[PDB]
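User: Predict the complex.
Assistant: Input components as received:
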Amino acid sequence: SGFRKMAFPSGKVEGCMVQVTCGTTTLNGLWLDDVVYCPRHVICTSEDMLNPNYEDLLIRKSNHNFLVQAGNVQLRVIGHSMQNCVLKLKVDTANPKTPKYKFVRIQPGQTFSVLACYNGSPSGVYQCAMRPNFTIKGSFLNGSCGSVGFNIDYDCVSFCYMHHMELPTGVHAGTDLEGNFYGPFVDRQTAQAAGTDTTITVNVLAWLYAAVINGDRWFLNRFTTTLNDFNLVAMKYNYEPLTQDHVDILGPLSAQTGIAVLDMCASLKELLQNGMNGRTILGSALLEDEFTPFDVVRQCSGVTF
Amino acid sequence: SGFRKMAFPSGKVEGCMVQVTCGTTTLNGLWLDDVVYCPRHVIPNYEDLLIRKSNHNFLVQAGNVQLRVIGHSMQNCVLKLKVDTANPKTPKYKFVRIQPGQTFSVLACYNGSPSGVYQCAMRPNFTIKGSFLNGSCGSVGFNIDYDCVSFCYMHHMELPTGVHAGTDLEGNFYGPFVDRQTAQAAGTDTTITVNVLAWLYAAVINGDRWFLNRFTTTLNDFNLVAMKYNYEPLTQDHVDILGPLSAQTGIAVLDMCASLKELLQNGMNGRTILGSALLEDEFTPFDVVRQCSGVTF
Ligand SMILES: COC1(CS(=O)(=O)N2Cc3ccc(Cl)cc3[C@H](C(=O)Nc3cncc4ccccc34)C2)CC1
Ligand SMILES: COC1(CS(=O)(=O)N2Cc3ccc(Cl)cc3[C@H](C(=O)Nc3cncc4ccccc34)C2)CC1
Ligand SMILES: [Cl-]
């Protein structure tokens, strides 16, 4: 019993965190085999950030301009290249602590763990979701750039995010490990703002199924809904449209609890209309959207209370 | 910017998790140097049950390697299995006993394999609101101070309300519990007042000031009000501990108490604080300072 926002154990990622310094800028890098991956803005000044020409800034650098530190050991950079918004620093030593890993690009609604780092040293781990507007609501201070997001289903680390910047609203933007930004963001000090955010509907439904598994059914009703009538109502509360894929994905949780997806959609519609009336669901007074159907099946028991 | 429920990095603890099997029971153990620590219920008159066991009855598995048990002893509700191999991954560590209100990270494990990490607090009723399934017994709670792991909790059981109970690493239970199948229940819980105040200071630091007002209060008037909402009494020590956050934000502790008093009497009125519609009590003053400063390990 219980339902917590649970992160993956971070040990496999901790052994990959290094510090990268170029001139006055210091940030974090991910050391996998003989390559250190880091945000390309490590080559920038604060002035450069308005309209940086990364190709022009990079051609002026040599390998020995990049200082890489793994613990108390200085790594020697023997090559460098840029792939999209990430810099790949070839080093003389392969990381003996390199785990089994993949680089995966995720979709909005997907969750992952963030190992927040400063000066190549891990400070904390927390669970996050890629918002529908492609930002993340993280907890990051200056010096956190290069911190990574990941999942560890089985013993393989799937790296899905590298931190690049904080937007004016306090939310965060970054790239996959191939350097492609999530969303329409640029690694430039440009007037850019997160688009209007929405609630991840499939995740709220998954969390309502988690509540039923743990023994709570106060929020259910005798009604059902068509998928179209549910979406017409959901859009009015800034909820993401629910697709047939989302309905298919919720199939296993529907079969375990005995509550059809469209019947759980009817309960959500009523919760949006009435609120909670002094009650909570899994210790929360708001509808939680940062647990996916996969996270619920992973954390919850296979036997409904 | 941002404020999340953050756990310590778990790597130093992951390298200590092992699987312990005795008969039909399988649970987790903590391997430090040449000793594996686990709940004694893996084997009730525990001394009588233990005398009938030999070293070879305890099967200990670290990853894909079988460790050989060469001795065993009981300390309170914890079994200490002496093994033939010292853990080469043993970190710098201490065994510490925490107080209610203090927080810690839990590395939840099944079959000696870590599955997740989450942050939680020792409730004033000595239970923890964890997330554990069958097979999680022996999972540990800890804090990291510089490079030293301070082990503070070992999981033993789930109570009927779904909350959890366990011991320190010396085998002493947190709370009036016993390690047997009998009628036991968590007492009525209260809210950790000093932690709610710390979280209100975290909200101010993150730019949320709607709850701030011109009023102040006395410690006595605040405590009279707090007792009526099932909040723990606020002591002069709690006021002293909140000193740094008070100086940083410019809001006196009894000034923040007047805001909390108004939040208890009026509610949030459709508003949230740090993305929450409830008053959060699982961040200590030190957790707030640490997350709003970037301390590393
Ligand atoms: C909205 O302005 C802020 C960021 S900044 O200092 O202006 N900054 C400009 C900028 C622009 C583009 C890119 Cl790719 C990186 C950056 C940098 C940046 O985003 N750094 C930070 C990342 N993650 C959390 C940070 C919390 C605080 C400070 C800085 C952080 C540096 C919050 C102050
Ligand atoms: C009231 O909870 C139940 C627990 S039990 O299976 O009866 N149980 C009896 C018992 C007695 C003493 C001691 Cl020290 C440990 C235990 C065990 C226990 O507590 N295990 C569990 C711990 N943490 C989460 C668990 C979630 C599910 C199951 C079991 C868990 C085994 C479901 C009925
Ligand atoms: Cl995805």
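Chain B touches chain A through 45 residues (CB under 8 Å).
Let me know if you want any component modeled separately.
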